[PDB]
Every structure is written in structure tokens, then in C-alpha cells.
């Protein structure tokens, strides 16, 4: 029973394809932790996005509907926009 991540996510690459890919490395000490992924339809193809290491990047694929893709939570949530 994992718990949400309290750290930030640093972006590395965003591409296209009818879906988006996002590569993010994690800054934190509380790993392994669930990735707070939200869209503001908006769906996450990646099942159970989880960090398990600070050094290791994570691949996240999302199917957005213009809205922001918010990976993270709190004062340092990574906010992006797409169409």
C-alpha cells in the first residue's frame, strides 16, 4: 500500500503520439511513492504510475482532450499545457 509522492518532478522530454509522452525524474527521499498525476476527459494510459528511485526516470503516457497536465502536487507541481 504505497503513498503519494511529496517531492517534485523534473521534466526531460515531452513528445506527441493521439497521445502524449512525458519523461520525468524524481527529486525526493520518500520513494517508492505513488505519482500524483492529474489533468486540469483526461486519462492516464500508464497504469499505477510509481517512482521507485530518485536516479531512475519514469515514463508517463497520457491521453488529454486546451488544458494543463499536472504531474506532482503542492507548491511544486509540474504544470504543463497541451492540445
Amino acid at each position: 500500500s504505497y503513498v503519494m509522492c511529496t517531492g517534485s518532478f523534473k521534466l526531460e522530454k515531452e513528445v506527441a503520439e493521439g497521445t502524449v509522452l512525458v519523461q520525468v525524474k524524481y527529486e525526493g527521499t520518500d520513494a517508492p511513492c505513488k505519482i500524483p498525476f492529474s489533468s486540469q476527459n483526461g486519462r492516464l494510459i500508464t497504469a499505477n504510475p510509481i517512482v521507485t528511485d530518485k536516479e531512475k526516470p519514469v515514463n508517463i503516457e497520457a491521453e488529454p482532450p486546451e488544458s494543463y497536465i499536472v504531474v506532482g502536487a503542492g507548491e511544486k507541481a509540474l504544470k504543463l499545457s497541451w492540445f
Partner: antibody
Framework: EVQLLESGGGLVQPGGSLRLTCATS????????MSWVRQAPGKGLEWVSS????????YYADSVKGRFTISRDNSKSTLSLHMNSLRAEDSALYFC???????????????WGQGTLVTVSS | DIQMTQSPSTLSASVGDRVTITCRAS??????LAWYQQKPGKAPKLLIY???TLKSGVPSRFSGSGSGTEFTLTISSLQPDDFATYYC?????????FGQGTKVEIKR
């Protein structure tokens, strides 16, 4: 407008239990992460626990892990701290804290209560 | 865990002088540092977050700089209601930890 009132503190013997409650009024309790931070006498601040604002994620300081549990009531808009196996070092002023923004994990302590004292001693 | 250390522990300075406090982190916390002020008898008050962003209502004589491992909190012109103990807290990830505190004294 944001006001927090902690209650439930007092004297309790070692190995005993206690339960603090934090009553809130000026904000949507649902959307915010809520925290417990303690200050022992003549010392600094020590974060105790955090209850996330996006799910039921709970976070605990190492010294406290396994002994306290932070619970949330979004009906009465109250934040409870259940303390068990209390130790001498747990004696302190217990503050209830509010995160600066909604839908967070308790990064900041934007609005504090006036505290509730906890003395652990036989 | 990340352990913060403040410098100096106690500080004496007269009203109107420009005074500085330092926070060092055991490891890089990027820009995820906040500064709280605590008056005697009262609860802490968040002054700064994300290194340099001022909380609403805080006078502009306060200003936070630094990044990575070293951070500084600066008071431009010390004032009467500015004597207190200042803590710094990283919010890089849990556990959240504070510095030991810097109690600033009004010289007279």
C-alpha cells in the same frame, strides 16, 4: 478568517495514550492537507505528521512512526492525532497547521493554531 | 533525513541595520525552502516560501535568496516588531525538517 483550535492536551503517564483534535472554521477542510507540528520547551520546531489533500496519504516523522496516527473528519472539519505508547520526549506544545494551498501534501504550514500542551510524566 | 543548520544561533543588531541569517542543508533541496518567524508566546508565521516568494502581508524589508545548499534570509531595515526566532524549513520531501532557530536581538 482561517482559525484553528487544538484541544485534548494534558498530563499522561508514560506508555499511555491521548487524542488531540483540531477544530477548523474558515476554509474548505476537504481540499487542504493538514499537519501536526510540535515544539518542546526552549527548543525548535519538529514536524509530527501530515494528512494529504488529494487522498488518504499519511506521513509520519521517524521518531513517531508506528505510535501516532493522524485522522481526518471532513464532516466536522476536524483533524485528530491519536498518540499511543507516549514517551518522555513526546512532551511538547502540539500545533495544528494548514497547508498554504489546496490539493497538496502538507509542504508548508501557512496557518497555525495556538497549540495544546502535552506533558508525559509519571 | 535532510538536516538543516542555521547560522548564527543568536544575533544582536540595532533597529535600522541590515541583518542576515543563513541556512545550510545537508543535501541540495533545489529552491524548496521556506522561512517562518515565531514571536515569543505566539505560533510561527510563514514569511517566505520557495526561497524568495513573499507571503502576502509580509513587509518588503524581508527577502530570501540563495539556492541549492546555502540560503539566506535578509531584513533590510530592522524594525520594532521584528524581534523573534526565525526558522527555515525545507519542503523538498518528507520528512519535513527545520533548522535549530536563530533568535535575533534588538540592540540598545
Amino acid at each position: 478568517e482561517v482559525q484553528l483550535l487544538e484541544s485534548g492536551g494534558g498530563l499522561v503517564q508514560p506508555g499511555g495514550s491521548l487524542r488531540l483534535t483540531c477544530a477548523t472554521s474558515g476554509f474548505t477542510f476537504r481540499d487542504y492537507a493538514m499537519s501536526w507540528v510540535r515544539q518542546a520547551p526552549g527548543k525548535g520546531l519538529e514536524w509530527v505528521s501530515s494528512y494529504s489533500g488529494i487522498d488518504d496519504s499519511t506521513y509520519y516523522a521517524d521518531s513517531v512512526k508506528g505510535r501516532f496516527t493522524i485522522s481526518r473528519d471532513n464532516s466536522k472539519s476536524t483533524l485528530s492525532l491519536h498518540m499511543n505508547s507516549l514517551r518522555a520526549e513526546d512532551s511538547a506544545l502540539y500545533f495544528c497547521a494548514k497547508d498554504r494551498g489546496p490539493r497538496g501534501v502538507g509542504e508548508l504550514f501557512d496557518s497555525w493554531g495556538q497549540g495544546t500542551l502535552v506533558t508525559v510524566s509519571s | 533525513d535532510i538536516q538543516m543548520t542555521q547560522s548564527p544561533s543568536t544575533l544582536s543588531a540595532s533597529v535600522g541595520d541590515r541583518v542576515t541569517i543563513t541556512c545550510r542543508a545537508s543535501q541540495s533541496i533545489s529552491k524548496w525552502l521556506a522561512w517562518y518567524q515565531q514571536k515569543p508566546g505566539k505560533a510561527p508565521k510563514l514569511l517566505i516560501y520557495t526561497t524568495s516568494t513573499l507571503k502576502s502581508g509580509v513587509p518588503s524589508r524581508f527577502s530570501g535568496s540563495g539556492s541549492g545548499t546555502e540560503f539566506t534570509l535578509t531584513i533590510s531595515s530592522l524594525q520594532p516588531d521584528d524581534f523573534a526566532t526565525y526558522y527555515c524549513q525545507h519542503f523538498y520531501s518528507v520528512p519535513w525538517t527545520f533548522g535549530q532557530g536563530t533568535k535575533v536581538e534588538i540592540k540598545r
